[PDB]
Paper text:
Two CspA orthologous proteins, BGA71 and BGA66, that are capable of binding complement system components C7, C8, and C9 and thus inhibiting the assembly of the MAC have been identified in B. bavariensis, allowing B. bavariensis to escape the attack by the immune system. The importance of BGA71 and BGA66 in the resistance to the immune system was supported by the gain of resistance to complement-mediated killing after expression of either protein in the serum-sensitive B. garinii strain G132. In conclusion, we have solved the crystal structure of the key complement inhibitory protein BGA71 from B. bavariensis. The overall fold of the BGA71 protein looks similar (Cα root-mean-square deviation from 1.66 Ǻ to 2.63 Ǻ) to the previously released crystal structures of the orthologous PFam54 proteins CspA, BBA64, BBA66, and BBA73 of B. burgdorferi.
All three BGA71 constructs were overexpressed in E. coli, but only BGA7162-251 yielded crystals, suggesting that the flexible region present in the other two constructs interfered with the crystal formation, as previously observed for the BBA66 protein of B. burgdorferi. The crystals used for collection of native diffraction data also belonged to the space group P31, but the unit cell size was smaller and only six molecules were found per asymmetric unit with a water content of approximately 45%. The final model of BGA7162-251 was generated for residues 69–251 since the first four residues that remained after cleavage of the His-tag and residues 66–68 were not built due to weak electron density. By surveying the crystal structure of BGA71, we identified cysteine 173 in α-helix D as the residue that forms disulfide bridges, which is responsible for cross-linking of the two monomers. Furthermore, comparative sequence analysis of the PFam54 orthologous proteins reveals that cysteine 173 is not present in any other orthologous PFam54 protein, suggesting that dimerization by cysteine cross-linking is a unique feature of BGA71. The structure of CspA showed the highest similarity to BGA71 among the other PFam54 orthologs of B. burgdorferi, with a Cα root-mean-square deviation of 1.66 Ǻ. While BGA71 did not bind CFH and CFHL-1, an interaction with components C7 and C9 has been demonstrated. However, the lack of binding complement regulators can be explained by the inability of BGA71 to form a homodimer in the same manner as CspA. However, the proposed N-terminal residues 37–63 involved in the binding of C7 and C9 are not visible in the crystal structure of BGA71 since they form a flexible loop region connecting the protein structural domain to the cell surface.
Residue numbers in the entry:
A (entry chain A): 12 to 194
B (entry chain B): 11 to 126, 134 to 194
Amino acid sequence: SKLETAAKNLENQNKQEYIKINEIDAQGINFLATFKADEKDNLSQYEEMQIKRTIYSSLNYEKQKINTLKEILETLYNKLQHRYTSKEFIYQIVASIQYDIDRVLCLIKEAIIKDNLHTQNQKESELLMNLDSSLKTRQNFAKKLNETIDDYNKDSKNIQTNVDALATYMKENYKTLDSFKPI
Amino acid sequence: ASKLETAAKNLENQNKQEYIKINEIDAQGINFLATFKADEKDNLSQYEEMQIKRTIYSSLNYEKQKINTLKEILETLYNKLQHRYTSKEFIYQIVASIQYDIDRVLCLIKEAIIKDKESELLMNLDSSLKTRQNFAKKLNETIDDYNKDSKNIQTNVDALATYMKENYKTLDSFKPI
C-alpha cells in the first residue's frame, strides 16, 4: 500500500542519513559547536541531528562544503549585530524544513497503525501530497544552499569579505520556509 | 536543557538500543512473526513489525527462550480458526497500541521542542511508559503460566484463548490510575 511504501522508503532514507551523518561527525568536525557553546538557547542533541539531516543531505555529505557553511554561520554569530540571522537560519528555516518532513511521517505512521482502511483511504491523498511538498521544499533549499556555498567561495557581492553583505544575502535568500515550497 | 529536551534524549537513546538488540536477536533466524507475515488478509509492514517487537522484546528482556514461547502461543491461536482473531488482536490491538502511544508522545515532544504543553506531554509520556511496564509485567506472568501449563493453557488451546482474552482485554486495562 502507498502509505506503507511511503513510510518504508522514508524510514530507510532516515537510517542512511543517520549513518552518514555520524560518519562525517566521527572525524571531529563539530559543525554546530559554536551553537552548542551558547547558554541563551540550548541545542539539544535531537535539535542538532535534525538540523544536520537537512544540511548534510543538502550539501551531499561533503565535509568541505559543510565547513564553509560553518564559517558562514560562525562569522554571523560572532558579530553581535547579526548573530540572530545565524540562529534564525538554523532554528527557523533549516529546522522547519526538517520538521515538516518528520511531522508527515509521524502522521502517516498513525494512519497505517491506528486507522482502518476506510479512514486510511480518506487521509491518504493529503498525506502523500504533504509528504511530496515537504521533500520538494528541502530540495529547493538544498539547491539554494549549494548556490550559496559557491557564491561564498567566489566572494560574490563581497559576501566573504563583508559580514554586513553576508547578513543581507542570508536574509534575502532564506526569508521564509514558504519561499522554498513548490509553487 | 529543558525537561522535554531531556525526555526526548532519553527516549531516543532508549529507542536506538532497542533497534540494535532486536536486530541482534532476529539475526539468529528466529522468525518471531513469520506466521503473521505469511498472512494475506492483513499486512505487517517491516515498520509495524519492528514496533511490535520493540514492546514485546523489551518486555521479555530480549530472552530468546521467552520470545519463542510467545511465538508458540500466538501460532497455536493463529492456527485455530476459531481463535485466530485473538492472536491478531493481541498483536495489532494491544501490543501495537501500547507501542504507538509511546511513539506518538515523542513525535509530539519533538514537535514542541522545535516548532514552538509541557506538563501534559510529560504526564502522557509517563503514562504511556507505565502502560508498557504493566503490560510487560503481565506478559512475563503469562509466559511463566504457559510453561507451568496453569489452567491447562499449554494443553488446551481453548483454555489458552480464554486466558489471553481475560488478561489482555483492552489497552486501557494496562494504564495507570
